[PDB]
Amino acid sequence: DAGLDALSSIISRQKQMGQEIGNELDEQNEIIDDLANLVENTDEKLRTEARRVTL
Amino acid sequence: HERESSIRQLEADIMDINEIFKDLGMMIHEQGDVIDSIEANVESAEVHVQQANQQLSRAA
Amino acid sequence: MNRATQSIERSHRIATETDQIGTEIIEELGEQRDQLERTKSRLVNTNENLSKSRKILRSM
Amino acid sequence: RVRNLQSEVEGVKNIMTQNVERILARGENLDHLRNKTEDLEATSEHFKTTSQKV
């Protein structure tokens, strides 16, 4: 009765948290993919400059 | 006892959710080490490029 | 009191702990996000520093 | 209502299970990224070394 009301409110917070976490994790995986691409490109510029140096 | 049963089963499901949070929490925390390493390799790469330019600038 | 009332109470207790684990998770992901963003900042900064490398090497 | 609570709990289990999948995926993506940063750090060492020579 009343115990279910307090419990229902608690579980209610859980759902929103669950959704916030999902949105956060999704964005972070985007950020990580973005970083992998930037690393790859920077690593290529590095290779190129190191070569020029040796020339 | 059907309402009682549904209520008791609800508890088992709430415990299961608690364990999912703990599982998610544990992995997020441990993955923190990987992120620490990623940040470190990048900071290190950054200083090396800076040190390298100091050298090239001196050779110029 | 009966099996239902006591089960509801335990669920209350467990569900509260879960919510607390939830806020802990959200806070930790926030720190990790910032760490990844700082990493990105350093990486692009380094990428631009490599353009100066090119400039110095051109003057060789 | 016990029926409502049951539905919300199933929804939470579904969302959180998907979040664990997102984290298992983030783990893979983080390891992949870490390897790339190790390659990056290695190349930067070479760059530094080669520059010290000229």
Side-chain angles (χ1 to χ4, degrees), chain A residues 2-51 53-54, chain B residues 1-57 59-60, chain C, chain D residues 2 5-54:
Chain A
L4 282 175
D5 301 309
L7 181 58
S8 180
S9 171
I10 295 174
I11 300 305
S12 193
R13 284 213 300 297
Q14 249 171 59
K15 194 176 192 301
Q16 217 68 166
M17 273 182 215
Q19 299 176 304
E20 297 176 6
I21 290 180
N23 287 163
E24 183 52 29
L25 291 179
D26 282 349
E27 292 198 8
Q28 276 193 35
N29 274 317
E30 286 300 335
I31 293 172
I32 291 170
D33 186 77
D34 186 20
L35 276 173
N37 271 285
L38 294 179
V39 169
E40 165 184 343
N41 295 176
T42 299
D43 196 50
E44 251 307 298
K45 287 187 73 170
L46 251 181
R47 293 293 199 188
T48 296
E49 294 311 298
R51 270 176 53 74
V53 179
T54 72
Chain B
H1 296 71
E2 174 178 45
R3 186 158 176 290
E4 155 175 325
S5 290
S6 292
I7 291 177
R8 299 171 63 162
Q9 287 165 47
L10 185 71
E11 186 186 351
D13 286 337
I14 287 171
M15 293 194 277
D16 282 0
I17 290 174
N18 174 261
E19 290 304 319
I20 297 177
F21 268 77
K22 284 176 183 171
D23 182 38
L24 173 63
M26 178 184 165
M27 293 189 270
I28 280 172
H29 191 58
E30 289 191 2
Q31 280 172 20
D33 296 344
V34 180
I35 295 171
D36 283 346
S37 298
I38 288 173
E39 177 171 49
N41 297 324
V42 170
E43 288 191 56
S44 178
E46 176 174 51
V47 303
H48 291 167
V49 169
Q50 285 170 162
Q51 303 178 316
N53 282 340
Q54 299 168 194
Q55 290 301 304
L56 299 177
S57 183
Chain C
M1 59 164 72
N2 52 59
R3 293 287 200 266
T5 61
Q6 300 315 290
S7 176
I8 291 174
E9 198 184 87
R10 292 192 299 272
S11 287
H12 186 295
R13 197 173 287 111
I14 297 168
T16 288
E17 167 195 356
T18 296
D19 284 4
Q20 286 163 174
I21 288 174
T23 63
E24 171 181 274
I25 285 175
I26 292 178
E27 189 287 327
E28 186 161 37
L29 288 181
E31 300 188 355
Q32 297 186 348
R33 162 190 272 280
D34 292 339
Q35 187 162 14
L36 290 172
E37 296 298 4
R38 273 186 277 99
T39 298
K40 171 174 180 179
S41 178
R42 288 186 157 68
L43 188 59
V44 299
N45 210 298
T46 301
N47 197 80
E48 190 274 352
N49 283 172
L50 285 172
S51 284
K52 173 165 60 184
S53 300
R54 182 170 178 286
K55 183 180 181 182
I56 301 171
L57 288 171
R58 279 176 52 78
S59 71
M60 297 280 111
Chain D
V2 175
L5 208 48
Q6 288 177 302
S7 179
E8 292 304 304
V9 169
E10 295 171 3
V12 172
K13 178 179 179 181
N14 176 55
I15 295 180
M16 297 308 296
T17 294
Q18 283 178 55
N19 280 330
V20 168
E21 288 309 325
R22 293 188 173 89
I23 214 62
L24 287 179
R26 195 186 72 154
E28 297 178 6
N29 299 319
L30 283 176
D31 292 353
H32 177 266
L33 178 56
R34 171 178 47 188
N35 297 323
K36 297 301 306 308
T37 57
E38 303 184 328
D39 286 343
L40 174 73
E41 199 281 336
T43 306
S44 70
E45 291 183 356
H46 178 217
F47 180 48
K48 175 185 178 182
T49 297
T50 303
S51 293
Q52 302 181 308
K53 306 307 171 58
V54 64

